Each structure stands twice: as C-alpha cells, then as structure tokens.
Enzyme design. Structure first.
Site, PDB file in Angstrom:
ATOM      1  N   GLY A 100     -14.334  -9.103   3.502  1.00 46.78           N
ATOM      2  CA  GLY A 100     -13.062  -9.208   2.788  1.00 46.78           C
ATOM      3  C   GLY A 100     -12.894 -10.516   2.048  1.00 46.78           C
TER       4      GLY A 100
ATOM      5  N   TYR B 253      -2.288 -12.412  -4.650  1.00 48.80           N
ATOM      6  CA  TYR B 253      -2.925 -12.109  -5.920  1.00 48.80           C
ATOM      7  C   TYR B 253      -2.010 -12.252  -7.120  1.00 48.80           C
ATOM      8  CZ  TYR B 253      -6.185 -10.530  -2.511  1.00 48.80           C
ATOM      9  OH  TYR B 253      -7.048 -10.490  -1.441  1.00 48.80           O
TER      10      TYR B 253
ATOM     11  N   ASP C 294      -0.037 -11.154   6.834  1.00 48.54           N
ATOM     12  CA  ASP C 294      -0.760 -10.679   5.661  1.00 48.54           C
ATOM     13  C   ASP C 294      -0.605  -9.168   5.520  1.00 48.54           C
ATOM     14  OD1 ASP C 294      -3.351 -12.092   4.042  1.00 48.54           O
ATOM     15  OD2 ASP C 294      -3.321  -9.892   4.059  1.00 48.54           O
TER      16      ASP C 294
ATOM     17  N   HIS D 230      -2.965  -7.220   5.002  1.00 50.68           N
ATOM     18  CA  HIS D 230      -4.132  -6.624   5.633  1.00 50.68           C
ATOM     19  C   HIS D 230      -4.223  -6.985   7.113  1.00 50.68           C
ATOM     20  CE1 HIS D 230      -5.038  -7.005   1.289  1.00 50.68           C
ATOM     21  NE2 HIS D 230      -5.590  -5.815   1.449  1.00 50.68           N
TER      22      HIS D 230
ATOM     23  N   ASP E 285       0.337 -11.449  -0.086  1.00 52.07           N
ATOM     24  CA  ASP E 285       0.065 -10.180  -0.751  1.00 52.07           C
ATOM     25  C   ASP E 285       0.977  -9.054  -0.272  1.00 52.07           C
ATOM     26  OD1 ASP E 285      -1.217 -10.121   1.771  1.00 52.07           O
ATOM     27  OD2 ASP E 285      -3.200  -9.715   0.947  1.00 52.07           O
TER      28      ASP E 285
ATOM     29  N   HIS F 111     -10.657 -12.229   7.868  1.00 52.18           N
ATOM     30  CA  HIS F 111     -11.592 -11.122   8.059  1.00 52.18           C
ATOM     31  C   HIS F 111     -12.975 -11.540   8.549  1.00 52.18           C
ATOM     32  CE1 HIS F 111      -8.698  -8.472   6.263  1.00 52.18           C
ATOM     33  NE2 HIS F 111      -8.718  -9.133   5.117  1.00 52.18           N
TER      34      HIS F 111
HETATM   35  C1  LIG Z   1     -11.125  -7.372  -9.420  1.00 54.46           C
HETATM   36  N1  LIG Z   1     -10.316  -6.513  -8.555  1.00 54.46           N
HETATM   37  C2  LIG Z   1      -9.045  -5.990  -9.033  1.00 54.46           C
HETATM   38  C3  LIG Z   1     -10.753  -6.201  -7.285  1.00 54.46           C
HETATM   39  C4  LIG Z   1     -11.992  -6.688  -6.828  1.00 54.46           C
HETATM   40  C5  LIG Z   1     -12.420  -6.381  -5.557  1.00 54.46           C
HETATM   41  C6  LIG Z   1     -11.630  -5.590  -4.727  1.00 54.46           C
HETATM   42  C7  LIG Z   1     -12.149  -5.293  -3.387  1.00 54.46           C
HETATM   43  O1  LIG Z   1     -13.341  -5.421  -3.090  1.00 54.46           O
HETATM   44  N2  LIG Z   1     -11.243  -4.851  -2.428  1.00 54.46           N
HETATM   45  C8  LIG Z   1     -11.711  -4.535  -1.069  1.00 54.46           C
HETATM   46  C9  LIG Z   1     -11.615  -5.782  -0.197  1.00 54.46           C
HETATM   47  C10 LIG Z   1     -10.166  -6.124   0.043  1.00 54.46           C
HETATM   48  C11 LIG Z   1     -10.067  -7.536   0.581  1.00 54.46           C
HETATM   49  C12 LIG Z   1      -8.609  -7.942   0.709  1.00 54.46           C
HETATM   50  C13 LIG Z   1      -8.528  -9.407   1.016  1.00 54.46           C
HETATM   51  C14 LIG Z   1      -7.175  -9.741   1.584  1.00 54.46           C
HETATM   52  O2  LIG Z   1      -6.159  -9.937   0.922  1.00 54.46           O
HETATM   53  N3  LIG Z   1      -7.176  -9.850   2.956  1.00 54.46           N
HETATM   54  O3  LIG Z   1      -6.021 -10.181   3.552  1.00 54.46           O
HETATM   55  C15 LIG Z   1     -10.408  -5.102  -5.177  1.00 54.46           C
HETATM   56  C16 LIG Z   1      -9.957  -5.404  -6.445  1.00 54.46           C
HETATM   57  K   LIG Z   2      -1.479  -8.748   8.917  1.00 57.62           K
HETATM   58 ZN   LIG Z   3      -4.449  -9.597   2.444  1.00 54.34          ZN
END
Ligand SMILES: CN(C)c1ccc(C(=O)NCCCCCCC(=O)NO)cc1
Ligand SMILES: [K+]
Ligand SMILES: [Zn+2]
Ligand SMILES: [K+]
Length: 349
Positions: free
Chosen positions: A124, A279, A151, A153, A240, A116
């Site tokens: 991200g 995760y 991924d 995302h 994920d 990201h």
């Molecule tokens: C502690 N907890 C359960 C969380 C903390 C932060 C987020 C969040 O900001 N989410 C928005 C950003 C998403 C980034 C995804 C990263 C990813 O896997 N990119 O491929 C969500 C849950």
């Molecule tokens: K992807």
């Molecule tokens: Zn992801």
C-alpha cells in the site's frame, strides 16, 4: 507543550519521494501561516538506524530495500526510497522518544502513519511501518499501548505486527467492502492466539458523516479504554476520509475527526499523533492544521491566511470543508450489530 516533529530538510525529504507531491510542504506551511508552530516545541527528527528499523522489519528486507534504493517482487517491491523511509521512521521514533522522556504529553509527526508495511513486505505504498516502530519505542516504558487508526483504510500492517500479543491493542475504523484495499479488517478479525480479542475492527460503508462517525468512535473507544486501560496512545489520522478526497468514500470533515481526537486527548495519556493516506493536498493541510489547533486548544480563523500556497485553497479559500451531497450507505442496524460484536469481544479482554 506539544512536540512538533519538523525540520526543513525533513519536509523536503518527505516531499521528494512522496506518493503525493508537496503535501508535507503545504501542511507545514499552513500550520506556520496560522503561527501554531510558535505554540509547540519544534524537535528535529533523527534518522532511524538499521537496528531501530530492524526492531520490526527483517534484516533481509531492510538490506534488499537499501540496495534497490541505491527479487524485489519477493518483498512486495525507486531511487532513494530507503533514506526516505528511514527519515519517516526516525521521525516517528523521535516523537516516541520525546514521550518516553516526559518532554511532552503529545508529539506530532504529520508525515508518518504508513500503516500497511509488514515485517518483510512493502504494501500500500508503505515501505516501512513507522507506526509499528513508534509503538515499539513506546514499549520501552509503557506496558499497554493503544493504537487507533482513523485512516480510510484498514491498518493491517500494524494489526498484523501485534496480532499475537495483548500488550498492544489495535483499533481501526475503515471502509470495508469487497474489492476495497487492503480487503481485511472485518469485525470478526480480532487477532490470534494470546492476542485474540486485542485487535478491534470497525467496518464502515461509503458516505459516513461527522455525527454518526463520532458516535461509533466514541462508543468503541469508551469500551476499549475501560477494558484495556492503555498507558500510551498512537493515533493515525489519515485525511483520506475527508470530503473532497479523490477516494470519494467517506464524507467526513476535520470537525468530526477532531471530536474523536478530543475524546482521546481527554484521557491525559502520552499520545503520538500521526498522519496517513491523504490525496487532496489543500484539504489535507486544512485537516491537519485544524487538528493541530484542536491539540493546542485554539480556535482558528476561517479565512486561509496569505502564504506560499494560498492559491491552492480555491474556490472558497476558507479552512472549513463542506460535505459532499451523496448518501450515507451505513445501515443503523448493521452498525449496531458491529458495535454489539465488539462489546462482546471486549468482555473477553
Ligand atoms: C494514480 N492513481 C489514481 C492511483 C494509483 C495507484 C492506486 C493503487 O494502487 N491503489 C491500491 C493501493 C491503495 C493504497 C492506499 C494507501 C492508503 O491511503 N492507505 O491508507 C490507485 C490510484
Ligand atoms: K483505519
Ligand atoms: Zn488510507
Ligand atoms: K494485539
């Protein structure tokens, strides 16, 4: 023999400032418990220099990131985060260097894939886009790079880095739904200017499973390979998507992802393997260990061998992951329409 980017210090660094704790240790420890490291060439990663990181990121962003690690709002912004990012970026660059030098045809940095980050903006939980840095290292030798992002995302940072060029084609399969991060990557997003039609996006809904996912992925990559004729591949394999991930969106197992990997490996191109978002700690190690086996052509034993983190593999203590009992929300006619749209975009390529 595949290159495995690894050092004890690198794994310790990756787990110190990780978003998810001990993930790098568990992945490596499971790969080691299956003795797959003995079948690979272990290469210590170098740390990315300021100049190497500036091949993509701006000096102002890198300087600010280095200072706060010792107006953060402006750059999308923790103690030590700069050394962490430089270590991961250096590891992906090291893998790319091994591919350039002909040391291997596959090089693996499971702790990379932070897709990201933008030139001047963290995003991200990505502070440095090691996938972009790796592609730019590969551009020293290879004229056309294919970036494939499996991924959950959308790989928006990598796509945006190369949106205006035809030297790098980005392909992302991802969940796409109003409100779901990062919100971009519809099938109509095809890049800009000279890069128009050199961004490919496959928007997918909750609940997809191994068979339909592979049918989509094989159909897209088949047309992409013929139209684009890539000379090297960078493959992001964030776990994920895998059933049991807290994201609880796709319903994949490593077997389905592995078939996508096998299809790419058959191209016999230089291939940089990255991890990504993930995760569920134990399932992440399961997935990437299995995919390492696929890269090595090895069948793995089902029981999780005794090792440091064995107690984390409950309640079943086996390598296999079972899909969740929830529906596949993907309409076959919507998927076909997306595939038709992409095929028409690639005729322009
Ligand atoms: C502690 N907890 C359960 C969380 C903390 C932060 C987020 C969040 O900001 N989410 C928005 C950003 C998403 C980034 C995804 C990263 C990813 O896997 N990119 O491929 C969500 C849950
Ligand atoms: K992807
Ligand atoms: Zn992801
Ligand atoms: K592009």
């Amino acid at each position: 023999v595949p290159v495995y980017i690894y050092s004890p210090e690198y794994v310790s660094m990756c787990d110190s400032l990780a978003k998810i704790p001990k993930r790098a240790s568990m992945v490596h420890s499971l790969i080691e418990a299956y003795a797959l490291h003995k079948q690979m060439r272990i290469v210590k990663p170098k740390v990315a220099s300021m100049e190497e990181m500036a091949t993509f990121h701006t000096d102002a962003y890198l300087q600010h990131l280095q200072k706060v690690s010792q107006d953060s709002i402006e750059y999308g912004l923790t103690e030590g985060i700069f050394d962490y990012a430089a270590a991961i970026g250096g590891a992906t660059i090291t893998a790319a260097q091994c591919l350039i030098d002909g040391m291997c045809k596959v090089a693996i940095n499971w702790s990379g894939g932070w897709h990201h980050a933008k030139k001047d903006e963290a995003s991200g939980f990505c502070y440095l886009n090691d996938a972009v840095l790796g592609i730019l290292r590969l551009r020293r030798k290879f004229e056309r790079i294919l970036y494939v992002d499996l991924d959950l995302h959308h790989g928006d940072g990598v796509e945006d880095a190369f949106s205006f060029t035809s030297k790098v084609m980005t392909v992302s399969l991802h969940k796409f739904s109003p409100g779901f991060f990062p919100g971009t990557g519809d099938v109509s997003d095809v890049g800009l200017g000279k890069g128009r039609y050199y961004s490919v996006n496959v928007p997918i809904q909750d609940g997809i499973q191994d068979e339909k996912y592979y049918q989509i992925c094989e159909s897209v990559l088949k047309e992409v390979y013929q139209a684009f004729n890539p000379k090297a591949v960078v493959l992001q394999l964030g776990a994920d998507t895998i059933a049991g991930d807290p994201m609880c969106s796709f319903n994949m197992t490593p077997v389905g992802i592995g078939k996508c990997l096998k299809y790419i490996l058959q191209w016999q191109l230089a291939t940089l393997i990255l991890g990504g978002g993930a995760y569920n700690l134990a399932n992440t190690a399961r997935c990437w260990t299995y995919l390492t086996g696929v890269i090595l052509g090895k069948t793995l034993s089902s029981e999780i061998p005794d090792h440091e983190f064995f107690t984390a593999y409950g309640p079943d203590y086996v390598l296999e992951i079972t899909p969740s009992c929830r529906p596949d929300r993907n309409e076959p006619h919507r998927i076909q329409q997306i595939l038709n749209y992409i095929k028409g975009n690639l005729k322009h390529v």
